[PDB]
Amino acid sequence: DELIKQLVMELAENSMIEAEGLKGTLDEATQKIELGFESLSSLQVETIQAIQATDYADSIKTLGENIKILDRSMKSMMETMRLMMEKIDLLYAST
Amino acid sequence: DELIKQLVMELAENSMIEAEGLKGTLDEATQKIELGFESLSSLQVETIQAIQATDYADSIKTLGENIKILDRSMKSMMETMRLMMEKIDLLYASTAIGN
Amino acid sequence: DELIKQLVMELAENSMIEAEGLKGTLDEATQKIELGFESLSSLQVETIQAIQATDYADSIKTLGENIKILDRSMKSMMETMRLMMEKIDLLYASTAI
Amino acid sequence: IKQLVMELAENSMIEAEGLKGTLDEATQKIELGFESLSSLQVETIQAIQATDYADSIKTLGENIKILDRSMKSMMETMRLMMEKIDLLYASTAIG
């Protein structure tokens, strides 16, 4: 009666202490989950933005353009060297 | 007594409020986790796809071919210039020593 | 009365219903956190490998090695052109009018 | 009865520490996921930021432009060489 009254009031004290404990921890876990996904998402966007920045499709276009220019300069040199070879042959023949 | 019945009825009522309060907070936490992993996982998949579909390799190949072609031509031009030097040498020796 | 018996037998049986409800959800949640980070870790490793396999530093390397060879042919031609001009100038002393 | 209640208090004490232990374990499995994945993301970003080669390709473009200038200047030197050969030829019996 007085012992059963102690038991029940003990249950209600210990239950609500435990219920609080578990509540407080869940809130901490919820803060943890919110911040953790906020950071993973931020770094995932930085990854995409860093890959975006590393674009060098334009570097390659420009390099290919200077190679074609050197190619055209080389073809003129070869033409010039054919004409020079002929003037050498002429001079030697004409000595 | 009516005391123990009132203590139990109060205990029972509060226990179910705390339990349903815990249950809902755990479901909200589980829902958040699921949506967290779901959303990040979608964007990482699309990140891998888009990396895989880049093709600079094709372009670096072409440039390497075009440089091999320039290299072959320059070896050809070095041969022409050796012959040109030999013909100049023959002109020099033959006019100097002959004449 | 059996009204103290009933109310408690009810609170005992459904508070155990609740507790298993929580234990079961907490055991799902845990399993999901594990399979979650396993999934993102694996995708992140696959990201790093997708990047590594589109790293062409070595292909650019070879490109640069091959441009160094053109440079060395150009150096060789420029030296031959220097010697040639000197031999042509020497013709001005040896070639009769 | 005193027993109906006393068993409840114990079964509820143990279910409770049963729960707090799986929770604190989840709370830590979560700190380790975020710490682990986040540093793996930092790696990834750092392995993109070490992998930029727009400058590498620009440098090769510059090497090509230097070769083009030497090629064009050799062509102007050989056109002088041709003028020198023509003058010599102009001076022979035949030219």
Numbering used by the authors:
A (entry chain B): 72 to 166
B (entry chain A): 72 to 170
C (entry chain D): 72 to 168
D (entry chain C): 75 to 169
Text from the published report:
It self-associates in oligomers through a central oligomerisation domain (POD) and bridges the RdRp and the nucleocapsid. Here, we used X-ray diffusion and diffraction experiments to provide a complete structural analysis of BoDV-1 P. We observed that P possesses a modular architecture, consisting of a central oligomerisation domain (POD) surrounded by two disordered regions, similar to other Mononegavirales Ps. Using X-ray diffusion and diffraction experiments, we revealed that BoDV-1 P adopts a long coiled-coil α-helical structure split into two parts by an original β-strand twist motif, which is highly conserved across the members of whole Orthobornavirus genus and may regulate viral replication.
Crystals were obtained for the POD of munia bornavirus 1 (MuBV-1; 77% sequence identity with BoDV-1) and Gaboon viper virus 1 (GaVV-1; 41 and 43% sequence identity with BoDV-1 and MuBV-1, respectively). The structure of MuBV-1 POD was solved by molecular replacement using BoDV-1 POD as a starting model, whereas GaVV-1 POD was obtained de novo using Se-Met derivative crystals. For both MuBV-1 and GaVV-1, the asymmetric units contained a tetrameric POD, whereas the tetramer for BoDV-1 could be obtained after applying the inherent symmetry operations of the tetragonal space group. MuBV-1 and GaVV-1 POD presented similar architectures composed of two α-helical coiled-coils (the monomers being parallel) linked by a kink. Globally, the only differences concern the relative spatial position of the two coiled-coils, due to the inherent flexibility induced by such a break and the crystal packing. MuBV-1 and GaVV-1 breaks were also composed of three residues, with a strictly conserved aspartate in the middle. The Ramachandran analysis showed that all of them fall into the β-area, with neighbouring residues at intermediate positions; this confirms that this specificity is conserved in all Orthobornavirus P. Using the Vc determination on the diffusion data, the MW were estimated between 40 and 45 kDa, 12–16% lower than the theoretical values, all corresponding to tetramers. The three X-ray structures fit perfectly with the SAXS data.
